[PDB]
Structure 1
Amino acid sequence: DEQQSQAVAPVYVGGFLARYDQSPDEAELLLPRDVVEHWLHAQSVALPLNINHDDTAVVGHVAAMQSVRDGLFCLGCVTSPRFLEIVRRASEKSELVSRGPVSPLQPDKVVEFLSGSYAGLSLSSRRCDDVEQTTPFKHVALCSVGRRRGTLAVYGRDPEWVTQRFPDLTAADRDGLRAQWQASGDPFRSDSYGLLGNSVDALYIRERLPKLRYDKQLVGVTERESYVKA
């Protein structure tokens, strides 16, 4: 009963929403540093964090967005108790979760589950297309894999520890983030049936795993140890 309270405690997520050094496979995915930094400075209210862009599946909020040297990095927090309770339960029934985490990390079913199902981040921003460079950043979505390479999502119970998984990040970067991450109920208006529904869609994404490994390698989270399952 206490173990179940530790499992449903807030969980943090971090990762790049876009890698400046990565030319997208599609023109509409182009999101350059000049634009990002402008948009950041442009738009207060936190961007909501949801599951695969579903407005009824908001599970938390983005706590910090920072533009670093290699891209736009963000740090958010899964806070919805309904989503976490669901995850808590689904995790108990995952052969993958049961096999546990790597080398010296302690098992963490909830975190491990999110680490497996939503290994990527996917931004929701206004169409760039190079014109009239309002709130451009709509929200951030946890997903099976992102359209932009390098968007691998890293989950952990501590924000510092999450940011620490990324070698590219400097102290000044981890500092700009720490400054930021330091509503009115449960934002989650969905359920297990929905997540399950969304799971089959994930099964049909092309080259899902290969992309994730690529993302894992590009962001250097391969080196450090974490709950990533890709």
Structure 2
Amino acid sequence: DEQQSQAVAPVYVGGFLARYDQSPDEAELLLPRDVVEHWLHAQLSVALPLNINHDDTAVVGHVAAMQSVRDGLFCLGCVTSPRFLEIVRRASEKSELVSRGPVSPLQPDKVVEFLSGSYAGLSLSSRRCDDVEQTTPFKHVALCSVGRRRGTLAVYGRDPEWVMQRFPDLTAADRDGLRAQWQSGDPFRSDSYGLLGNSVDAMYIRERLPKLRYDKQLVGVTERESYVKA
């Protein structure tokens, strides 16, 4: 009864929403450093919502921190939704992937390990950044199977310090900026059928796994350790 309450505790997510050194597969995915910065400055006020694959009825949390760093944009969000966390707790109990558990030194975390296999990537939702122009341009972040912009792997953890330390690229100064940022109840308006449904979409996205390893290597989570299942 308490173990279940232990797993249902808040989960933290962090990742690059965009790695400046990467050329998109689609022109509309262009988000330059000068643009990010200007936008970041124009907006942070209220906390952007964190949702499941951009669905407005699947808000699981909020983004706690946003920070343009040398290699791209970084975000730190927190999954605080009781219902979502419970759905994940329940479902994790039924996955053979989760069952195999993490890599040695890491302790099992069914909920974190579930979100990590499923929603292995972050995806920002923002203003149309098109040639010749560059308020609230950042709309929301979305947890999804993969991202359209490479290098947006999602690192899940129970401690914002822990997840942050997973990315070799970040620097003390970076983490400071972020930390300083984090320093009506349950927003989820969907359910297990809703997420079961979403599960099929992700299953037809071409080269998802190959993208995720590319992302893993790129961001460096390879040369570290987490519950990344990709």
| TM-score normalised per structure 1 | 0.99
Q: Displacement of 1:181 after TM fit?
A: 1.1
Distance in 1, matches of 2:20 and 2:196, equals 33
Q: Displacement of 1:185 after TM fit?
A: 1.3
Structure 1: runs of 5 or more not aligned: none
Distance in 2, matches of 1:30 and 1:121, equals 16
Distance in 2, matches of 1:157 and 1:143, equals 19
After superposition, what is the alpha-carbon deviation per residue over 1:32-56, rounded to whole angstroms, capped at 9, x for unaligned? 0000011001100010000000000
Per the alignment, in what secondary structure is the counterpart of residue 60 of structure 1?
Answer: strand
Distance in 1, matches of 2:228 and 2:16, equals 15
Across the aligned residues of Structure 1 and Structure 2, the Cα RMSD in angstroms comes to: 0.5
Distance in 2, matches of 1:14 and 1:160, equals 10
After superposition, what is the alpha-carbon deviation per residue over 1:194-230, rounded to whole angstroms, capped at 9, x for unaligned? 0000000110000000000000000000110000000
- What is residue 216 of structure 1 aligned with on the other side? 216
After superposition, what is the alpha-carbon deviation per residue over 1:138-192, rounded to whole angstroms, capped at 9, x for unaligned? 000000000000000000000000000000000000110000012x111000000
After superposition, what is the alpha-carbon deviation per residue over 1:94-144, rounded to whole angstroms, capped at 9, x for unaligned? 000000000200000000000000000000000011233221000000000
Distance in 1, matches of 2:144 and 2:65, equals 19
After superposition, what is the alpha-carbon deviation per residue over 1:32-87, rounded to whole angstroms, capped at 9, x for unaligned? 00000110011000100000000000000000000000000000000000000000
Per the alignment, in what secondary structure is the counterpart of residue 221 of structure 2?
Answer: coil
Distance in 1, matches of 2:102 and 2:54, equals 28
- What is residue 18 of structure 1 aligned with on the other side? 18
Q: Note the 1:72-221 alignment, pairs <5 A.
A: 72-182=73-183, 184-221=184-221
Per the alignment, in what secondary structure is the counterpart of residue 222 of structure 1?
Answer: helix
Distance in 2, matches of 1:88 and 1:221, equals 25
| TM-score normalised per structure 2 | 0.99
The answer to whether 1:226 aligns with 2:226 is yes
Q: Displacement of 1:27 after TM fit?
A: 0.4
Distance in 2, matches of 1:46 and 1:130, equals 28
Structure 2: runs of 5 or more not aligned: none
Distance in 1, matches of 2:67 and 2:135, equals 19
List structure 1 segments (4+ residues) > 6 angstroms apart after TM superposition. none
Distance in 2, matches of 1:123 and 1:61, equals 12
